[PDB]
Design a protein around this ligand. Structure first.
Ligand SMILES: [Cl-]
Ligand SMILES: [Cl-]
Ligand SMILES: [Cl-]
Ligand SMILES: [Cl-]
Ligand SMILES: [Cl-]
Ligand SMILES: [Cl-]
Ligand code: NA
Ligand code: NA
Ligand code: NA
Ligand code: NA
Lengths: 389, 389, 380, 384
């Protein structure tokens, strides 16, 4: 197998994309997380390209049998069912299952006895170890099997189920994401399992991966990676998406203004944007001085992109952009939607935004203008956020 | 002393008003809580009126020495400094100090050793046992002293301090109020203290109070009171304040409209109120159908008050109300402020509003119109809140 | 159960340290006395069962609890959080806490925890305790010897071997009476507060039972009464009683030895010497002679009653020679003279206490008549 | 410390149950052997300190840990969450878990947990264990006897007293060799998974030390090697050795008794009868007589060497009469005949195993020469 990879020139890696902090699909061709980073390092070490292949827990082993990928790096628990068809690496992590529920009912679900009874509405994603564990250790409970995820933890928030039981590390993270949810004794889970790399029945590969892993572990490199991706501000990932998406749109804004040969400064639009942001921010209890600064920065950043393009296009004496979207009817609506998103992210994650060596990953739109990207983030640096509050 | 009370005809009771669930000043002449209810029962038993006298922890004993009140019922810990000047009753409760912090950092602050070091930002209210305990058992930490005890737990939510150490029962409550906060091992506090009634140096009174208390305890009456005031929806208390204050203003609205003999229906104002509420609600992620229903009800309730008054005043041939405030300039502004408050309370406490035998205390404005009061609350009954979500 | 498990087993097992007058004192044997032993009694009666005191100590307190060696603990136990981890408590029957005890000269040297907490000062505590925890927390700079017997620990202060101890203010009220040289430091204004309550296991129905019982006792004045009794109780007399007891138990050996040589029981020379020597020694302790003579006459007559009963028994059995019987002149009579000393010193301390004024001696097992004889001149 | 406290104290204290071949077996005495005893050894050497095995058991495992009876535990301990509460673990040196073992006829009767979990079936486990927890969780309906000795528990299945046991697949691979009548049930496909690792105390510097040590051992093939050694190790011979040992230690009593009557050491009648009776009994067990005779000749000659050494010692001391010396005819010789039985049965089981292939007997304390004599005809070459 190891030769087939070297020949094909590419490591195909299964990843569910549903399991923060291991493997998350933020969109696009944009997977992030611990096990995505590791897949990266392994590819580099073999001297080949990486390809993430999407999978899911229900489809995991059938996708393996169809040879859709070479390995799976996705916070996979070593289990015996899986050992039937597959090899595993040495473990890189030790975890296992603990409950997550609304913060009121933490005491209602301390024990498997408390949990295993017909009163209780249990929820799991399908295919999983999470499904197997719920069927084995809580049969009497009422089990809905809910075939989506990231939004499965919504079902508990909204009272539609009572609790879920999942890996204690998933639970530590989801309690940060949903403040209304709480992890149940995650330092003392109900059981133990290894996390390791799913491999095919090929011993030379297993030896390769294991040697690789043991090196990474002993040298501190995995420990480092674990620190990064747990202290990673998963909560700020929407905030980042909003700032990012808004800036990338400045390209379209420029195209449209260019066609009408509008000037870049549009003082009416600036006043409205800021005035409307402040109003919306007051309803969310944000202070106005700060909201204004934030949005001033967003505008100034946009305008830097615009100015760079206008310069370029004046030099070209460029003409008319044919599939440029409408400013009033398409674009400006999108921008106003994002303003909302951005303000809400500011409102929720005021604490998370004061931590300092817990820091966001870099914007896509530094590709477009690194200067503009800096401008946009400037008033969300911890020091100014503390300055305001 | 017991005779001086009977003579004066009034029991003067210290209460800090800062310590849910014992003693809270919701405004006004409006104290509520366990120890306010108890002060009530003691007054009744002596056959006298109750007067709450405001105090605070910093002023507690000086206010006692100035004979500003007879006793103090306010979740007061028995301590030796206080025993110097004062008697105590028998205990009605046994507690003591445990940390509260963001749900992430539960594990960071399990122990006093973990807590007592210069990295950590500790916060306490002044005057207290809480201040004395933090100075004695955690000197190396950074201690900000933040002189308002109701909004102090905001400072932790918002990352401005790391944790607070306070009575484990206060911590049980504040974790319910702020879902993002979590109590640290409140079943296993760092220490123990009695809660009891602060009394003056007079033995006949002490015997009276103690006999009273022992009766209340043995008969189940205190146990009952404890159940009530812990299951009391403290979270919904602002929501209730907003609905209440808004309805009480309908009295002013009627006075003003009466002077101009305006009609009660104003369909423009109705459309604007609802339209503006829905908009604001969208920014808070409330669903619009529900916000509209809620506010329809608030309007219909206002109009019921108006109609009752108009009828009354036609019968009286009442004249002109001289100090009636301006509708456009004074009143309608206030109403719009309260709309904001009300929406935010809806946004936060969607879960709390689905619990059913945890129910709010009755509105002040049932004095004005019980029918209107019913109308206003109707679309915040659990069944309709669940119907919408 | 738990309340049912007790009713079934037919016995209430109660922890008691036996080291903490006036709550719980082990005078020997199966012979516990004090406030909390009396209370354990009343609770047993109320449940309609027998009482069994189970010995414990402060260092072993909670491990003994976890091994289910007893049902409850009644022993002047402070409510503390460590103990609340494993256990329930009753309602408090007392509110107290820690205050210093020191020699009466140095009362003013140790008014405050600042005065106390410094490296000059020699502090002493019994181990296991709240007393140990409090000394470590509130006086770390002082020099701390940990002295593992709580009854004779107050001797160490008297004798200058430590400067002070810090303990429950009620313990301090008592020990200042027992050692006239020691004085309680502001016991009406202790350094802190604690509840005393009954340690219970994690069973709510029992807690409700005990609490209802206790609240009754408190509200009716019955606990207040019990407190008055057991503080005004003449604790001073307990060594005197131990000495009379030990001396009488030796009459068994005396008889064995005399039997082997078939000596007669009455020995008028020995009687005169014993009394004469007691009186002399008593004069040095300022005891009046008439009284010492009476006391020791009684002790002699009591011894002889034991002897006579045994001689009768042994004549009937035709018992032979007792092989491991100690020598009279060389082993036994020395021991008797040692105890005479102890007995006289106990008399000398408690001359006042013996105007005010009892359960049986251990040696009522041997001869109840002799035991009566021995106590007779400590009436009145 | 902790690593410093060990270096200071000069000794590594290691828990071992002594009940779990091939990891940890207590043959007696201060005589532990196995994979994890060998490893404990290597770790001690690496720290530059002496080893002390501290006995423990599964029921007492964690309480003994909390009482600080030892530093670490190396005993084929599964990583479990209960244990993680009080304790750290090393990296795993093995991945295993539970599979059935039963008589070779009933292999097909117990393929699945469904087949196993029902009231017809007589299940057996040792207590304290993961083995007990797993049987209670995954097979409640079965009849569960809890049999508190883990070495002879597999006898109960052989003898039909229970139907099967469920235990670590590696334990099952070994016990099927030891009892030919028993068979492992799909040990390449267990019902579940667990790590084996070293139980450590809450001290991170030590954990780093042990882990670095272990990762080296693993990556270099040294643990794989050690696994091969201790599975191919002739465990069958350990009872045989116990019987030779016990029999020789009795020669001390034999001498005491003969000394009191000043009997001579050589007794050619007794020799002929011992050998004659052993051969007869051996024929019923299908042992060949020539070999049994050799073995027992050696046992006799070895006994006599002990006797001679003691007689010499006692003549020099002019020792007198031994007062609590047992009777020869009535107490001792019976015991010797009981052990002969044991010894022959151990020979009968391990005829194959005695084509392969030792440490000292306990009775080298008594006479090293005699101990050599006793073992001499169980060198391969004499099994001609
Ligand atoms: Cl998994
Ligand atoms: Cl207080
Ligand atoms: Cl405490
Ligand atoms: Cl205590
Ligand atoms: Cl006295
Ligand atoms: Cl195990
Ligand atoms: Na010290
Ligand atoms: Na005194
Ligand atoms: Na053995
Ligand atoms: Na069963």
């Amino acid at each position: 197998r190891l030769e087939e990879i070297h020949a094909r020139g590419v490591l195909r890696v299964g990843s569910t994309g549903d399991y923060k902090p291991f493997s998350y699909r933020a969109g696009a061709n944009d997977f992030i997380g611990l096990d995505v980073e590791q897949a990266g390092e392994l590819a580099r070490a073999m001297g080949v390209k990486l390809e993430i292949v999407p999978t899911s827990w229900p489809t995991l082993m059938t996708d393996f049998g169809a040879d859709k990928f070479d390995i799976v790096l996705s916070g996979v628990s070593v289990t015996a069912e899986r050992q039937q068809q597959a090899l595993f690496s040495v473990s890189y992590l030790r975890d296992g299952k603990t409950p997550i529920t609304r913060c009121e009912n933490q005491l209602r679900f301390q024990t498997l006895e408390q949990i295993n009874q017909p009163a209780v509405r249990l929820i799991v994603n399908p295919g999983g170890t999470n499904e197997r564990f719920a069927r084995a250790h809580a049969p009497h409970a009422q089990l809905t099997v809910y075939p989506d995820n990231v939004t499965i933890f919504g079902q508990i928030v909204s009272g539609a189920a009572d609790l879920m039981m999942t890996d204690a590390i998933e639970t530590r993270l989801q309690q940060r994401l949903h403040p209304e949810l709480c992890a149940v004794h995650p330092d003392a889970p109900f059981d133990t399992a290894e996390k390791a790399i799913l491999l095919p029945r090929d011993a030379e590969l297993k030896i390769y991966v294991d040697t690789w892993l043991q090196q990474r572990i002993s040298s501190g490199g995995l420990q480092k990676s674990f620190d990064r991706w747990l202290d990673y501000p998963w909560a700020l990932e929407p905030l980042r998406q909003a700032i990012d998406e808004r800036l990338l749109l400045a390209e379209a804004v420029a195209r449209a203004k260019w066609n009408v040969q509008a000037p870049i400064e549009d003082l009416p639009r600036e006043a409205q944007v800021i005035a409307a942001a402040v109003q919306q921010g007051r309803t969310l209890g944000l202070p106005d001085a700060w909201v204004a600064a934030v949005f001033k920065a967003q505008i100034e950043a946009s305008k830097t992109v615009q100015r760079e393009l206008y310069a370029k296009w004046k030099a070209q004496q460029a003409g008319h952009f044919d599939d440029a979207p409408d400013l009033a009817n398409t674009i400006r609506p999108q921008l106003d939607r994002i303003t909302t998103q951005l303000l809400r992210a500011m409102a929720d994650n005021q604490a998370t935004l004061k931590d300092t060596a817990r820091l966001i990953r870099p914007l896509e739109a530094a590709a477009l203008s690194p200067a503009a990207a800096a401008q946009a983030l400037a008033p969300l640096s911890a020091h100014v956020v503390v300055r305001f509050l």
